[PDB]
Structure 1
Amino acid sequence: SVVEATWNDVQLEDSLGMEVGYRLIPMVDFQQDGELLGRIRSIRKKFAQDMGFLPPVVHIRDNMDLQPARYRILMKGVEIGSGDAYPGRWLAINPGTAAGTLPGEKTVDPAFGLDAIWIESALKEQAQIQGFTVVEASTVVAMHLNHLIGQFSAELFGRQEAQQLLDRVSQEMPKLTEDLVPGVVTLTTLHKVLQNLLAEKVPIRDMRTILETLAEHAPLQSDPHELTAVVRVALGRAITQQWFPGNEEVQVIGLDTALERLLLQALQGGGGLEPGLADRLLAQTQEALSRQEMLGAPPVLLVNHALRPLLSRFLRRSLPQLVVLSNLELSDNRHIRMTATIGGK
């Protein structure tokens, strides 16, 4: 080479990163249009004002070993998504209810997994009237990215984001924070609590409700996996209205009155549930999810309060579409109807 090596040649890893084939460099270019840098900003914005924290910056670079119209999406180094995106062309997507077909590459949308076909420019308005939904090239890469952020939002929430959320709270209600951390709760513990909440799709906008439940129940309990289910009920009115809007009936999934005892028998017994039970649940749990799909009902499971911290810990690494709530989290002012059931068949 020409210039001598300095420590500025050390490229620290990126929390979030994109790699780009040379055909896409225009849409990600500082200097030219930047048609996708705009979309990445409005993702990160409509995530802070929505999920309750700022996703880390998306470091975009190119990699000439990538096919020309291809991108990779990266977390802490390791790929977590890739796809094709063709600039001058558009993406006709089918929600299931479009009439006809179109000429072009047949493919599947990288977000929703829907069936979709890349089409050329002048088919736009003609593809829409057949019942399609046509997004720009740049918008597909946006779609794929806003999906993976919501999917990994727990892992993207590092100690550096906890300390940054803790500064943003501690500039609108400083009295809570000034003595809650590092005094009564340690940032390690506050961070693990918010991360547990993000992990189950519960937003952390209500830091009053959180930092108060913690400042109250902390000096007699320090396990974050225990302080979490306490905070969960503080946010019960909000978790309720999340999967069950309006004031109408609550269509939940239920487990058998003895299956409960079956599982509840295996709780206090030790740090382990027994094998054979497993594969039975996951098939039986997926039986209940399907009934709700054809009914038009949410995918929420309502269980005993000591039975939630592990059904969500077990069932969701397999069925992440599942919600696992608690009798003590659901509001009193609602009517419940166990529409589907997890029994012995």
Structure 2
Amino acid sequence: GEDSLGMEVGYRLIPMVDFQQDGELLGRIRSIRKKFAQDMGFLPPVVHIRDNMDLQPARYRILMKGVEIGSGDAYPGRWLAINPGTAAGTLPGEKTVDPAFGLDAIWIESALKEQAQIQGFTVVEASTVVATHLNHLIGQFSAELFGRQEAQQLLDRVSQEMPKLTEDLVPGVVTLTTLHKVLQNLLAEKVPIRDMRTILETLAEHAPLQSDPHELTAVVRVALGRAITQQWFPGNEEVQVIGLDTALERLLLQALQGGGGLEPGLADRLLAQTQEALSRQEMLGAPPVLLVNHALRPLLSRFLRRSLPQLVVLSNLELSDNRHIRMTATIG
């Protein structure tokens, strides 16, 4: 009954979503959905747009299965001047916060656009503010948006290109339930699922031996290690990562191996130090990537990303073996 993905708008935002008028936001939505399909392998559901007149005139909401996941203001006659961290001074206008990243921002008249840019502000128009927020929410909720129906539709599409591979695999070797869970686990850590041949071929080799979607996910991630490596370290420059202090690594390994647990305070400090390492990577311009021993990757991914979803936790078995790695930050 409820649309998988929906948007509600006050009356001032109707033009940017009206195919008979300017409809600028409709074209941005299409590019967002196309870019997710091509880059992540995940065609998001259509965004059902409807007017809502008890909403403020310049207000929009974004909803998933009828549950609001985001909202904000967009003023068609104004630009949003966003301070990325380097802007200088202030501008007159409605002070706010950019909906995607939480950065300080100001809605400004058109006549201040260039002045704001000279002051180092990133200046975007109203429809782009909404699009950016939607694009961010689709990314944040990619796994939740990829339900069983979505998994079936994708399997049906790939079946057209790879009929024999898909026939030998589902449902006799891996069920849709298991395939959906593995694909969801990949999307949950921002791993693209566009390379369905490698994914299905890997499941075909290991599903007969391991029915656990958790273990399949680890083996699929290794099979996709080149795509994962190029996602966070595109090109051929030095791979700059966070690493664990050597002593910490062994304390965690021996805790999972029944050799003695770590005091709870050490876990809290582990989390605090991961946040500090993230801030350092950001300051260095390096990726938000923590590289760890294969045996630790699922644990630390779940433990740390619960509080720090921006963190990427990779296994040493996933990182392309021809890359030069440098630990630019150390946790512990």
The TM-score normalised by the length of structure 1 is 0.89
Quote how far apart the aligned CAs of 1:178 are: 1.0
Matches of 2:236 and 2:14, distance apart in 1? 49
SS in structure 2 of the partner of residue 196 of structure 1: helix
CA deviations over 1:182-228 (Å, ceiling 9, x no partner): 11010111111111111111111111111111111110001111100
Identity of aligned residues (%): 100
Quote how far apart the aligned CAs of 1:172 are: 1.1
CA deviations over 1:296-340 (Å, ceiling 9, x no partner): 322211111111011101100101111111111112212222222
Instruction: Find out whether 1:290 has 2:279 as its counterpart.
Output: yes
Q: CA RMSD in A?
A: 2.1
Q: Which moved more, 1:269-278 or 1:112-121?
A: 269-278
| Structure 2, unaligned runs of 5 or more | none
Q: Cα gap change, 1:50/1:273 in structure 2, threshold over 3 Å: closer, same or farther?
A: farther
Quote how far apart the aligned CAs of 1:166 are: 0.6
Q: Cα gap change, 1:174/1:110 in structure 2, threshold over 3 Å: closer, same or farther?
A: same
Matches of 2:187 and 2:261, distance apart in 1? 25
The TM-score normalised by the length of structure 2 is 0.93
| Structure 1, unaligned runs of 5 or more | 1-12
Q: Cα gap change, 1:273/1:227 in structure 2, threshold over 3 Å: closer, same or farther?
A: farther
Q: Cα gap change, 1:336/1:35 in structure 2, threshold over 3 Å: closer, same or farther?
A: closer
Quote how far apart the aligned CAs of 1:129 are: 4.4
On the 8 A contact 2:251/2:262 being kept in 1, the answer is no
Q: 2:248 aligns with which of 237, 241, 259?
A: 259
Q: Cα gap change, 1:58/1:291 in structure 2, threshold over 3 Å: closer, same or farther?
A: same
Quote how far apart the aligned CAs of 1:118 are: 1.2
Quote how far apart the aligned CAs of 1:55 are: 0.4
Q: Which moved more, 1:151-160 or 1:128-137?
A: 128-137
Q: Cα gap change, 1:63/1:263 in structure 2, threshold over 3 Å: closer, same or farther?
A: same
On the 8 A contact 2:238/2:324 being kept in 1, the answer is yes
On the 8 A contact 1:267/1:273 being kept in 2, the answer is no
Quote how far apart the aligned CAs of 1:125 are: 4.2
SS in structure 2 of the partner of residue 155 of structure 1: helix
Matches of 2:313 and 2:84, distance apart in 1? 27
Matches of 2:163 and 2:42, distance apart in 1? 18
Matches of 1:307 and 1:104, distance apart in 2? 49
Structure with larger Rg:
1
Quote how far apart the aligned CAs of 1:293 are: 2.6
Matches of 1:83 and 1:268, distance apart in 2? 48
CA deviations over 1:47-103 (Å, ceiling 9, x no partner): 111111210111122222222211111112221111011122222233333455432
CA deviations over 1:93-124 (Å, ceiling 9, x no partner): 33333455432111221112222221223333
What does 1:93-242 correspond to in 2, within 5 Å?
93-242=82-231
Q: Cα gap change, 1:21/1:228 in structure 2, threshold over 3 Å: closer, same or farther?
A: same
Higher helix share: 2
On the 8 A contact 1:163/1:187 being kept in 2, the answer is yes
Q: Cα gap change, 1:155/1:274 in structure 2, threshold over 3 Å: closer, same or farther?
A: farther
Q: Cα gap change, 1:125/1:336 in structure 2, threshold over 3 Å: closer, same or farther?
A: closer
What does 1:23-38 correspond to in 2, within 5 Å?
23-38=12-27
On the 8 A contact 2:17/2:25 being kept in 1, the answer is yes
On the 8 A contact 2:254/2:260 being kept in 1, the answer is no
Matches of 1:104 and 1:69, distance apart in 2? 16
Matches of 1:297 and 1:51, distance apart in 2? 22
